[PDB]
Amino acid sequence: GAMNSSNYAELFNNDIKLFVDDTNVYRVTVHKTFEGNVATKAINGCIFTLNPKTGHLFLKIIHTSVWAGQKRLSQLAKWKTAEEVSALVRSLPKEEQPKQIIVTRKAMLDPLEVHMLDFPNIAIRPTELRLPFSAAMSIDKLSDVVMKATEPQMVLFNIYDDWLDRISSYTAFSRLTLLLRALKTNEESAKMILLSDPTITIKSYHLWPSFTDEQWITIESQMRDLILTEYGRKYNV
Amino acid sequence: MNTVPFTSAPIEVTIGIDQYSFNVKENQPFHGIKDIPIGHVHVIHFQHADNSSMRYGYWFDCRMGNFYIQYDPKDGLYKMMEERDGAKFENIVHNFKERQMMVSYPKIDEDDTWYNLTEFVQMDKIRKIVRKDENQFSYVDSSMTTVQENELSDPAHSLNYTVINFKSREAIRPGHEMEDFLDKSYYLNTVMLQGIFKNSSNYFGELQFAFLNAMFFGNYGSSLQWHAMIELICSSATVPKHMLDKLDEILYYQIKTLPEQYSDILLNERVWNICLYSSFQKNSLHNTEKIMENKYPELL
């Protein structure tokens, strides 16, 4: 059924699964028109499809042209997400196809179920976790590839960089969700933490900086402090 | 006007005939029901005084044979049987009528209620939903499950309603996923009407039969079927105008006839609120919406 705190270790077992987050598929800026009415202008978006065990990120870029002439875009966006996830699954060899797909928002359940009727053995699950995957567009290289796209495009990343060489998936996912939660709560401060030291760089083929183990501990501590700080600033505690 | 004689009434029982009902005491001198209107199907149904578990009954059409009821003390229920000997039957009935041991089907002349509830119900279609081909009449009870229910257990005793499932390959054309899920016209008009039912009359007959089995027996899978067939129409943007108008009349008389104190279990809040207030056909069921609002405003 639903994915929650009780069954958290299931994410790192050896059954292939994918998280799907649609929060950045349909993105707009709201502006005033010359006549003083309000209008939206869409910008490029992306589907965030992640294997939590391996780090493999299937970043499908949603180019603004897909919305041209379409109505009810926030509804269409869920069906387009479902269409693209189904197409990804069909594109994978059988032994790479997920056994479960977990959607971060319950409104994706029926669109994905309908698009996956051809795969009755793939379980479509909601989650009670508040995962911070919306903050994916706070990762500079991901934001950059989305905004520069001039056509629909799939881009592949490992969101864990090379961390699995040194740590388990459970710990890598914990690190990722802490980083993304911090980028979501105070992006400026989070990025200041990650880049403040000029000597630590990001490899060309990586998303995050090349921290040693001790430095990751320091970083992780700083990120927790940030989240607690923001929580105090927000709630006045 | 035809007759369903009873051999006897050995156990105390509430007897239903269509929308009417009456109580017979243990060994009361009761020998059946006369003056039953020809031209409609009918249902005679039973609820034992000592064990209200299992409402059960028989759908029949008097044009298809001479039928009577006789209690079976081994299986513990009132059974319908066909009498093949025409003169024996007529002689038995005439005796019982002369001694005035039969109740009279109490049809008010102004009253079209039964016609309106059974307008599209045919025995031949009942007998394909309820498979027992050696009899001309069809047994239904409270506990019988539907083919769809059994998929999610005895097949010989099932209600073979047409399976409707909105998240199924039958309902959803490859490549029209969003279109077909949000607007079920394809599934209604091509798959169900043209494909399976052949016409709206057969669709409405099954809908009316499902309601009646839900109401008279408390048959839950029948209630599910009734609501699914309503929802499939209401959720279609493209429905022939004559079906919408007839649907409104059909539902009106079903809501009118429902016992006020059974509404809590027989009516599905989500389906009705969706159909009357959110669906494509939210504005197409004037009569049904007015009676629902004036009679069951809590459900909404």
Ligand SMILES: COC(=O)[C@@H]1CC(=O)N(c2ccccc2)C1
């Ligand atoms: C580096 O060696 C590999 O095999 C790469 C690692 C990785 O993250 N991959 C990947 C990433 C996204 C989608 C599919 C595959 C394959």
